[PDB]
Amino acid sequence: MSPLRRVLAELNRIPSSRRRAARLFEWLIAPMPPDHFYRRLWEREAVLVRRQDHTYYQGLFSTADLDSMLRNEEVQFGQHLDAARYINGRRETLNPPGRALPAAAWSLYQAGCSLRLLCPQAFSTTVWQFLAVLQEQFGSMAGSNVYLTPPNSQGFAPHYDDIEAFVLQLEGRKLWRVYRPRAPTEELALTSSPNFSQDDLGEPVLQTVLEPGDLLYFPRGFIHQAECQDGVHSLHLTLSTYQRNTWGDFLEAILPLAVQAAMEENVEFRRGLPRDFMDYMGAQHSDSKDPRRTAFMEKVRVLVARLGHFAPVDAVADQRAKDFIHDSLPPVLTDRERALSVYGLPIRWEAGEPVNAQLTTETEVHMLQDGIARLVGEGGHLFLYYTVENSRVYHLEEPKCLEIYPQQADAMELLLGSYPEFVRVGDLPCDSVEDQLSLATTLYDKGLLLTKMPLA
Amino acid sequence: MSPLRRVLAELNRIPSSRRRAARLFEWLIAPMPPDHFYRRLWEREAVLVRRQDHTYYQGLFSTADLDSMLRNEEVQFGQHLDAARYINGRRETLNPPGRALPAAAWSLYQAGCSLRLLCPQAFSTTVWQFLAVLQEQFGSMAGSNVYLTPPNSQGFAPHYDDIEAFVLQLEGRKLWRVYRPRAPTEELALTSSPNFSQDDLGEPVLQTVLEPGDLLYFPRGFIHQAECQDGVHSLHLTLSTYQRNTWGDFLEAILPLAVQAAMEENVEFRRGLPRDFMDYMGAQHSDSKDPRRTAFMEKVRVLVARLGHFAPVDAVADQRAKDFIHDSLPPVLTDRERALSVYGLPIRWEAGEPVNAQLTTETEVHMLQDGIARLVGEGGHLFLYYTVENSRVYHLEEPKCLEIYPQQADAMELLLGSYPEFVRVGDLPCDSVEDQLSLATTLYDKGLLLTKMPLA
Amino acid sequence: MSPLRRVLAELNRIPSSRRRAARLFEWLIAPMPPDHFYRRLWEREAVLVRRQDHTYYQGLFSTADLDSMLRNEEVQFGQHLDAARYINGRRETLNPPGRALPAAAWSLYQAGCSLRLLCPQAFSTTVWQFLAVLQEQFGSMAGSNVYLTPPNSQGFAPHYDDIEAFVLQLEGRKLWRVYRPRAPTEELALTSSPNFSQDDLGEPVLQTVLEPGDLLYFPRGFIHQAECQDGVHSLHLTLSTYQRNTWGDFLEAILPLAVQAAMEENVEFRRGLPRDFMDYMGAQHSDSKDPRRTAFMEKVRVLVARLGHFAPVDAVADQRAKDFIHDSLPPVLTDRERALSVYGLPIRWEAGEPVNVAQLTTETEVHMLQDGIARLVGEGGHLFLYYTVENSRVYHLEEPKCLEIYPQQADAMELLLGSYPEFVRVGDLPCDSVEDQLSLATTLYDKGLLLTKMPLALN
Amino acid sequence: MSPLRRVLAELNRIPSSRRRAARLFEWLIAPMPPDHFYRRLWEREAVLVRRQDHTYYQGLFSTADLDSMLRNEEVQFGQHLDAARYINGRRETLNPPGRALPAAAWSLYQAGCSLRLLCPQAFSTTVWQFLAVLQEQFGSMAGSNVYLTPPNSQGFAPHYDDIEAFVLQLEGRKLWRVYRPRAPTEELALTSSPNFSQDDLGEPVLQTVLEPGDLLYFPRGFIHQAECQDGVHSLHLTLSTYQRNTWGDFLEAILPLAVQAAMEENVEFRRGLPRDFMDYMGAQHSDSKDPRRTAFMEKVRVLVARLGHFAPVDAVADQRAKDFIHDSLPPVLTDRERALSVYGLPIRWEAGEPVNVAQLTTETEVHMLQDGIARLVGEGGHLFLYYTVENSRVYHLEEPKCLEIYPQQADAMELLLGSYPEFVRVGDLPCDSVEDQLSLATTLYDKGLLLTKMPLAL
Ligand SMILES: O=C(O)CNC(=O)C(=O)O
Ligand SMILES: O=C(O)CNC(=O)C(=O)O
Ligand SMILES: O=C(O)CNC(=O)C(=O)O
Ligand SMILES: O=C(O)CNC(=O)C(=O)O
Ligand SMILES: [Mn+2]
Ligand SMILES: [Mn+2]
Ligand SMILES: [Mn+2]
Ligand SMILES: [Mn+2]
């Protein structure tokens, strides 16, 4: 077994989804310690991990897998696959319209075009598990792109991305050039950059040839470009996460709610503006030393600083967790998780008819996995959003939730916060035995709960 | 000659529109001094002014004007005129569809229905001038409604408004009851309230019978109601201003831009959120004791406070100023202002053809009026927005502006700031004399500038 | 007094709105008989009427009025006034944004630009009455445009319009050239043409210099162009009507309704298409010799012909009447009509209080205010009376207006509509009772759609 | 083997997709002759075929397939599966929200709920093939629904559909009742009816118990209802076709085009209406004896009849063909078709590069992949070839797909579409240049619309 197949087999043996995610990330950057990586290198500098083992990723994704996909799946150009090339300093996109059959894709490849698969997790169960598990320790959606570049060519123009990137070299070799942010405003850039020319760049802070097994990481804002040497092609998978997951994004959501709450709860935010402020505020008064401006600006600073007191921080955290649920890949269940939940509940047939299975107050249970559900308050109501009905295709499924009544709130929170400890249904903090069985049965039937022993 | 006609005649002799505005407001609340009113009563207390002069408002509006309006104008029910009556603690609306002809209106009036004209200024040139001048010293759109209530009746249920109200008793008398905000949240209310019942009310802070010439002012949020006693009907005009012109409103517009600027200018606002903040933030963690929760809360509060430093106060002031220009009533020119502008340039048919002079570098000029234009910077471009082409009907006319080029900005701002001081064209700060003439000419032709002496 | 002022004064003394319309049109083309005009010249030939009377249109509109309007009204460039110039064979438009003040307009005029007023009826009460009266005999909206061209210039490039035009020369002179439709597809054109060049034209079927008082008429599809002589300016008003009022426009509305009816009422229109018609129908089979192709074609033709039986002709006629009412200018009342309608009913005042209270008795004589102000229309299974009395002089500013007519009143409503201008006594209205009999009459009177033989109150 | 598996094996050996479709329909209603069926029964009468063979449809769809689907596919309630029951004369729908897991579905079934699968063809390759082939001889979309009703119950209230229905009894038995259209307006109804009550129904024209292998056909407008007798459950597949495919539908699209063309080409349609027709036309005037009213009416009928001469029939036929291509299921290729097309072209990856990477020459012999996968359509002064090869098995999931055919290629395209399944040498295509012959053939082959007589990768 290769290291990748080995660790995946190991993951199936780890009862907690939280621990499985920590383990896979540990494996991803080994031998570098995760603690050291997040403390000093995450979002700060480019990092190269020389693996010394070309088989490290064997089983994750290969060119034969790409070929098999184009033939047996409905892979579309533009929607799923891009064909591009960077020749004569110009970025070209040769995307024919329609389905990307093997004959077409490979003809483009033989003509020097690079092929980029936009959603491999939708077509590969191994990439799916890989991302589903890693998204849990990033606390942010984890996507991927697969890049196949033919010998002696470059598929893309230098540029920097709007996400944190992990480059896994799968096949062949490729010369990579990584540059530090060119200016202060480019550090941890908010959006993807345009295509740059060789003249827009300076001296790379990291230039190296990657080999199968190696890993190259760099923060958003770091310009990069890669090319294949003589005779050897290159296949790599880029793992991306942390798209617009900043303090500023958190603030953009909290501010309108904070002002709204301040206006409704405090008369000072309700008082009228001065009748003559238009006489000293405005671009045509920017050079003015009018004492009225200073007082006006001083009031703006004081009111804005107040707003902190009215900021609904928990509500915004829940709104972001809800969007995370919506963006998430559905879970990959271990053999045990499937066997102990409604997914592995057998239906016995006799005489051509199904003959069904009930939880009791003695049944011990806990959440299917740690990152598949979230309690969210909306419009004075409580809703439990979940990922178990999500597609492997990004946003193909709309947000899924079920209403949690006030009486069940305490028990629901207990279940979400005590994973993976088993809890008897009869020990749930509800006002009646009937309420305990009701909540447990609802969660179990929806595939959100597992039992210590199979129900049947 | 009534006091009103007296002051209007007086305003026609005052050179500055700014002085005219201050003079008219002083007149409106005489003998109470403006300084005292704005400093202690405005947005704070209800105020009554026993004029002791039934002729104070003669010339402003009368029942004869209303009657004449229905006859000679296209007054429509719903859009222009409402009919209502308050019987048995229940608000009624008897609005027939279509035009409100005298016969139909007076018929409803006889049935005990009150009549409410929604936009008097569109039909009465005096009310128009009255509101066009006052809007200048309020620094906010000033509107009005005329109420005609038949004897022994009440047209409306008790309620509070979302604007500052000035009630001018025009004919007859009416028993008015004004109440202080019922609760902190209702003080300076953001929106109009629903219809209240006598039970939802306590003791009125002011109960009085108004008579012709009297003035009754009260802040948004003060519930009120009025009724006519046996034997005399009532006609009054309510002047309204300050609709959604609060600090909260200023903040709602400034914050989104502030965070955006903060994220682009300071890397701290671009840093990634913790990978695990969802483990301790959110409704399901409201009682968590994790110290990271407290640190997260404290960080949000400091980031919010710091946003004030990035708030584009001038840009937002210009946007509100631009909206004020759009919402403004067109200017009412004095006899001499008209005689000195393009609106007074003599032109006819002579010899069967147009008679058709031009302005030179020795011509003294200054803005037509003080509150008719505003320079706004949008998308790296100077725009001069104006009110001169506005309709007396609210928003009937779309926003109107004139693009200003860089080499003319200083000259424009100078003209806007030096009102009403005349300035010879040659003294304009411009690159070539062809620009001093170009600018002065364009402004004169649009009806935004006047000359020291008839240019013809 | 000018002929125009003299005919208008006369119209005020003509009680029937239908007869007034006929009289004004008669006056418009005098001495040519209306019967002859419609029977042989309407939609067929260009017609010139040499009035031999320069003061014929005096009072309708002048350059003085145009000046006054720009000075007192909110005239906007593009919206109400256009500034054009046709020089070097090219058509240019110099419409600056914003209000068109006298200073700007006249400056453009002095620069050789022709000025065109798009809606004179909204600003001139005389133009308004003229069009309000003529629309009734055209049975189609009547609009107008005013044109003022400076000496020695041409404001517009040759072209043809999508409406029937009547050119009234008001001031100065102008050389007109009218060409007969170039090709068969241009005869009675449906839409306006682009700007043509002198090269795309042939020989005029009528060339003449119009002078004040003259009338020039030409059908849609006839190309035309005009130029001003030396030292003399030109002012004329073009009366227009019949925009999209063709048999085809009628068909376009009736067809979708006919198929729907045929499909719900006759199973043959509900039967399935052949399973294999795609094998012989379509562009890739235009050369097929399969006999099923000919049979298919004949089948379509017979089914189309058969829709005629399911065509709701009356319903579509009411719908077109409804739209005409929506496009109509509000009526212009005679002294008498006003004096006998709600618009002339006085309100008595006592102690600064209206006490006028005068209802309609069962012995009142009444009839529709005018003959072309209302129309009964059935929709969604109900009856509605659409009217024009609340329309604005500005095209489509006012939305369609109507009041519901209940089944028990239909007969009485059709009686009044079809008996104008004959006075009918309320008590004789075929209603369900005397109550409903008085209800109808009062409602109609209140909306300003009915008049009484004697004023209900003397002012 | 089962009759079904035997006929499907037979179709894999039949060269023409057109013949394959005729053969399968013949099999579907055997022993009844198709000619007789379309001539006297189709859209006219309910038909019962007593097969006397319980294994006739063996292999098409079973309860086990349904169970396997619920467990291995993302079957959603509402979107993919319905759970209903007819109790006390009232129709009930017990569709919970979300995914339809086996546990949830079987519990409802146990509670007396019938289960209906809305798009079997998306989850079963056999049903897909069955419908893809039959749509070709219907000339209209062929859809299907699967109904599983538990013992002793009725799932749906009596009603009639807006499509032609073929009921295929798969497992168990079921008592069916079919009624003749109640009134003239309901004959060949255009839209589905609401739920009816037993009181609205008269006497059945057809009442019988269906057994595995039987076939029950009935036109749109025929009310029907069924229940499971005490004892066994029932599973059936209903094949539907001919939704809004009537002469009236053809007319609706052609009329506006006809008037537009008539007005543009004939002055009579451009002449003005009378200035006073409002005086004698309209509801108020329906009684009027005005002779002008008679003439007006006659002119409308005359102008309407003249419209036929201006009806663009081929243009409307192409638009409907275009919609048919859009609603079609993608083709199911025989082994030979796949092996002779781009789909079966060996270009597999090995040695670290693309191996076995075969071009068409003027010597190559070709013909359309199948007969019902493409259609030439004229739109806005241009020619487009619409095709079905990239359609999803899910209705309308994929947008309309086409490629532009330039005027210089029109003749060659029509030749290929019209000479199927005869082989034509690329060098013999009627084009203006040799390169044009190669260019068209290569483009069509690469899109999966053409096959070659011999594999290109020899
Ligand atoms: O591989 C290349 O040519 C470009 N790759 C990337 O931009 C990436 O992996 O994010
Ligand atoms: O006059 C009345 O009955 C009520 N008036 C008002 O609410 C007002 O003037 O704002
Ligand atoms: O008067 C002109 O120059 C042009 N006139 C017209 O096009 C017209 O009256 O319809
Ligand atoms: O099976 C049932 O109960 C009802 N079936 C149908 O309506 C059908 O197959 O079209
Ligand atoms: Mn990149
Ligand atoms: Mn109020
Ligand atoms: Mn014209
Ligand atoms: Mn059915």
A395 dihedral zone (left: phi>0; alpha: psi -120 to 50; beta): left
- Sequence ranges of chain A with CATH classification 1.10.10.1500: 247-310
- CATH code for residues B247-310: 1.10.10.1500
As a whole number of angstroms, the distance between CA A205 and CA A176 comes to 11
- For chain C, the three-class secondary structure string (H helix, E strand, C coil) is CCHHHHHHHHHCCCCCHHHHHHHHHHHHHCCCCHHHHHHHHCCCCCEEECCCCCCCCCCCCCHHHHHHHHHHCCCEECCCEEEEEEECCEEEECCCCCECCHHHHHHHHHCCCEEEECCHHHHCHHHHHHHHHHHHHHCCCEEEEEEEECCCCCCCCCECCCCEEEEEEEEECEEEEEECCCCHHHCCCCCCCCCCCHHHCCCCCEEEEECCCCEEEECCCCEEEEECCCCCCEEEEEEEECCCCEHHHHHHHHHHHHHHHHHHHCHHHHCECCCCHHHCCCHHHCCCCCHHHHHHHHHHHHHHHHHHHHCCHHHHHHHHHHHHHHHCCCCCCCHHHHHCEHHHCCCCECCCCECCCCCCCCCCEEEECCCCCEEEEEECCEEEEEECCCCCCCCCCCCCCEEECCCCCHHHHHHHHHHCCCCEEHHHCCCCCHHHHHHHHHHHHHCCCEEECCCCCCC
Closest CA to D66 of D212, D229, D235, D185: D235
Task: Tell me the C-alpha distance between B366 and C343, whole Å.
Answer: 49
Say if residues A243 and A163 touch (Cβ distance below 8 Å).
yes
Q: How many CA atoms lie within 13 A of A410 on its CB side?
A: 9
Distance CA A310, CA A255 (A): 9
D236 touches D147 (CB < 8 A): yes
Of the candidates B421, D109, C295, B389, the residue with the CA atom closest to the CA atom of residue A353: D109
Cβ neighbour number for residue C297 with a 10 Å cutoff = 15
Contact B313 A281 (CB under 8 A): yes
Q: Return d(Cα B79, Cα B100) in angstroms, integer.
A: 10
Question: How far, in Å, CA of D106 to CA of D108, rounded?
Answer: 5
Q: Do strands D81-87 and D47-49 pair parallel, antiparallel, or not at all (unpaired)?
A: unpaired
Residues pairing with B87 in the sheet: B90
Q: What is the DSSP letter of A39?
A: I
DSSP secondary structure string for all residues of B183-246:
SGGGTT-SS---PPPGGG----SEEEEE-TT-EEEE-TT--EEEEBPTT--EEEEEEEE-TT-B
Range(s) of chain A covered by CATH 3.90.930.40: 311-456
B406 within 8 A of B435, measured Cβ to Cβ: no
Q: How far apart are CA C222 and CA C189, in angstroms?
A: 9
Provide the residue type at D401 as one letter. Answer: K
Name residue A91's beta-bridge partners.
A86
Strand A364-367 to A449-451 pairing: antiparallel
Q: Are B281 and A305 in contact (CB < 8 Å)?
A: no
Cα B206 to Cα D190: distance, rounded to the nearest angstrom:
70
Cα–Cα distance measured from residue B407 to residue A142, given in angstroms and rounded to the nearest whole number: 52
User: Is D35 marked as a binding-site residue?
Assistant: no
Q: Which CATH superfamily is domain C1-246 in?
A: Cupin (2.60.120.650)
Phi, psi of D193 (to 5 degrees): -90, 165
Amino acid at A192: S
Q: Tokens in use for B207?
A: 């109960």
How far is B120 from D244, CA to CA, in rounded Å?
58
C-alpha distances (whole Å) from A21 to each of A11, B217, B434 are: 9, 67, 73
In this structure, the residues whose C-beta lies within 6 A of any atom of ligand 1 are: A 114, 147, 149, 155-156, 161, 165, 167, 226, 238
List of residues 6+ apart from D64 with CB closer than 8 A: none
Separation between Cα atoms, residue C181 and residue C189, nearest integer Å: 9
Q: After which residues is chain A broken (C to N over 2.5 A)?
A: 356
Q: What distance in Å separates the CA atoms of residue B127 and residue B138, rounded to the nearest whole number?
A: 16
Bridge-partner residues for C168, per DSSP?
C215, C237
Of B165, B182, B185, B173, the C-alpha closest to B223 is B182
What is d(CA C235, CA D445) in angstroms, rounded to the nearest whole number? 70
Neighbour-count burial of D231, counting CB atoms closer than 10 A to its CB (0-12 exposed, 13-18 middle, 19+ buried): exposed
Distances (CA, A) of B319 to B260, B312, B314, B415, D75: 17, 11, 9, 20, 53
C-alpha closest to that of D221 among D190, D196, D250, D177: D190
Tokens of D377: 């359509």
Give the ligand at the shortest distance from the Cα of C217: 3
Question: What whole-number distance in Å separates Cα of residue A147 and Cα of residue A234?
Answer: 8
The top-level CATH class assigned to A311-456 is alpha beta
What is the Cα Rg of chain C in Å? 27
How many CA atoms within 13 Å lie on the side-chain side of B315? Answer: 15
Number of neighbours of residue C434 by Cβ within 10 angstroms: 12
Q: List the structure tokens of C16.
A: 């029937």
- CA dist C131 and C141 (Å) reads 9
d(CA A247, CA B268) in angstroms, rounded, equals: 8
- Do the Cβ atoms of D144 and D120 come closer than 8 Å? yes
Ligand 1 atom nearest the C-alpha of A154 is 3
Against chain A, the chains showing at least 3 CB pairs within 8 Å are B, D
Whole-angstrom Cα distance, residue B370 to residue B331?
A: 10
CB pair distance less than 8 Å for C187 and D270: yes
Taking every pair of C-alpha atoms in chain C, what is the biggest distance, in angstroms? 94
Residue A359: CB atoms within 10 A of its CB come to: 19
Residue at token pair 């006298």: C102
Residue ranges for the known binding site of B for Fe cation are 159, 161, 224
CB contact under 8 A, C67 and B349: yes
Helix, strand or coil, per DSSP, at residue A421: coil
Beta strands in B296-381 (DSSP E): 349-350, 353-354, 364-367, 373-377
- Please count the other Cβ atoms lying within 10 Å of the Cβ belonging to residue A59: 16
Is residue D401 within 8 A of residue D390, CB to CB? The reply is yes
Q: Residue for token digits 């089979």?
A: C285
End-to-end CA distance of chain D: 35
**Residue from B274, B289, C398, C202 nearest A246 by CA:** B274
C80 is in an annotated binding site: no
Phi, psi (5° rounding) for residue A218?
Answer: -155, 140
Q: Rounded to whole angstroms, how far apart are CA atoms D140 and C276?
A: 9
CB neighbour class for D327 (10 Å; exposed up to 12, middle 13-18, buried from 19): middle
CA distance D207 to C436: 57
What is the per-residue DSSP string for A355-407?
------TT-EEEESSTTSEEEEEETTEEEEEESTT--SSTTSSPPEEEEE-GG
Burial class (CB in 10 A: 0-12, 13-18, 19+), A76: middle
Give the whole-angstrom CA distance, residue A68 versus residue A101.
Answer: 10
Q: What DSSP state is assigned to residue A41? A: I
Distances (CA, A) of A395 to A10, A116, A222, A384, D167: 30, 20, 28, 18, 38
**Cβ contacts of residue A149 below 8 Å, gap of 6+?**
A114, A155, A174, A226, A227, A228, A233, A234, A235
Of C165, C281, C150, C148, nearest in space to C223 by CA: C165
Which residue, D124, D104, D125, is CA-closest to D113?
A: D104
Burial class for A378, CB neighbours closer than 10 Å (0-12, 13-18, 19+): middle
Distance CA D4, CA D170 (A): 12
Angstrom distance (rounded) from CA A42 to CA B273: 12
Min distance D74 CA to chain A CA atoms (Å): 8
Lookup: tokens for D386: 């619409």
Asked if C116 and C155 count as a contact pair (C-beta separation under 8 A), the reply is: yes
DSSP D6-61: HHHHHHTT-S-HHHHHHHHHHHHHTTS-HHHIIIIITTT--EEE----TTTTTTS-
- CA–CA separation, D47 and D206 (whole Å): 9
Nearest by CB: C103 against B106, B151, B347? B347
User: D190 CA to chain C: closest CA distance, Å?
Assistant: 7
Question: What type of residue is A12?
Answer: N
Do the Cβ atoms of B407 and B366 come closer than 8 Å? no
Tokens of A146: 């697969």
Give the list of residues 6+ apart from residue B253 with CB closer than 8 angstroms, or none: B316, B319, B320
Q: How far is CA C155 from CA B213, C86, C94, in A?
A: 58, 5, 11
Residues 6+ apart with CB under 8 A from A202: A179, A182
Nearest CB to C106; choose among B74, B98, B347:
B347
- Tell me the two tokens of residue B75: 């007054």
Pairing of strands C215-218, C402-404: unpaired
The CATH-assigned architecture of domain C311-459 is Alpha-Beta Complex (3.90)
Is residue D99 within 8 Å of D334, Cβ to Cβ?
Answer: no
Q: In angstroms, rounded to a whole number, what is the distance separating the alpha carbons of residues C403 and C383? A: 9
Q: How many CB atoms lie within 10 A of CB A178?
A: 25
The dotted CATH code for D311-458 is 3.90.930.40
Q: How many CB atoms lie within 10 A of CB B48?
A: 15
Q: Which residues in chain B are immediately followed by a break of C to N over 2.5 Å? A: 356
Look up residue A391 and give its two tokens: 């597609």
In angstroms and rounded to an integer, the radius of gyration of the C-alpha atoms of chain D is: 27
Task: Indicate the resolution in Å.
Answer: 2.2
d(C-alpha B330, C-alpha C50), whole Å: 48
How was this entry determined? X-ray
Residue A424, burial from CB neighbour count under 10 angstroms (0-12, 13-18, 19+):
middle
Which residues lie across from A225 on neighbouring strands? Answer: A177
Number of CB atoms found within 10 A of residue D183's CB: 7
- Comma-separated ranges of CATH 3.90.930.40 domains in chain C: 311-459
Ligand nearest to the CA of A149: 1
Strand ranges, E, within A231-368:
234-241, 349-350, 353-354, 364-367
> How many angstroms separate the CA atoms of B283 and A413, rounded?
9
Residues D124/D61, Cβ–Cβ less than 8 Å:
yes
- Terminal C-alpha separation, chain A: 35
Q: Is B270 helix (H, G, I), strand (E, B) or coil?
A: helix
Q: Where in chain B is the domain with CATH 2.60.120.650?
A: 1-246
Indicate the length of chain A as a whole number.
456
Question: Using CA of residue B349, residue B350, residue B354, residue B359, what is the dihedral sign?
Answer: negative
Question: Which one of D255, D293, D385 would you mutate to disrupt binding with C, by most C Cβ within 10 Å of its Cβ?
Answer: D255
D319 lines ligand 4 (CB under 6 A): no
Rounded to an integer, what distance in angstroms lies between the CA atom of residue A141 and that of residue A122?
Answer: 15
**3-class SS of residue A276:** coil
CB of D178 closer than 6 A to ligand 4?
A: no
Buried residues in B221-254 as b, exposed as e (16+ CB within 10 A): bbbbbbbbeeebbbbbbbbbbbbebbbbbbbbbb
In contact, B241 and B144? CB cutoff 8 Å: no
Cα–Cα distance between B176 and B174 in angstroms, integer? 6
The C-alpha atoms of residue B233 and residue B227 are separated, in whole angstroms, by 9
Residue pair C12/C23 in contact by the 8 Å Cβ criterion: no
CA B183 to CA C129: how far, in whole Å?
Answer: 60
Tell me whether chains B and C touch (3+ CB pairs under 8 A).
yes
Q: Which helix (H) or strand (E) holds A174?
A: strand A174-178
Write down the residue that tokens 């008719």 correspond to. Answer: B372
* C174 vs C228: CA distance, rounded Å: 5
Starting from the edge strand earliest in sequence, which strands make up the sheet with C402-404, in order? Answer: C374-379, C382-387, C402-404
Nearest to C101 among B109, B400, B447 (CB): B447
What is the DSSP pairing of strand C164-172 with strand C234-241? antiparallel
Q: Is C237 in the pocket of ligand 3 (CB under 6 A)?
A: no
Q: Which residues of D are less than 8 Å from A445 in CB distance?
A: 101, 103-104
Tokens of C271: 């039967």
Nearest to A352 by CA among C192, C409, D427, D212: D212
- The structure tokens listed for A208 are 């190296």
Taking contacts as CB-CB distances below 8 angstroms, the residues of chain A near B247 are 268-273, 299, 303
Mutate-to-test residue for ligand 4 from D225, D229, D240, highest number of ligand atoms within 8 A of CB:
D225
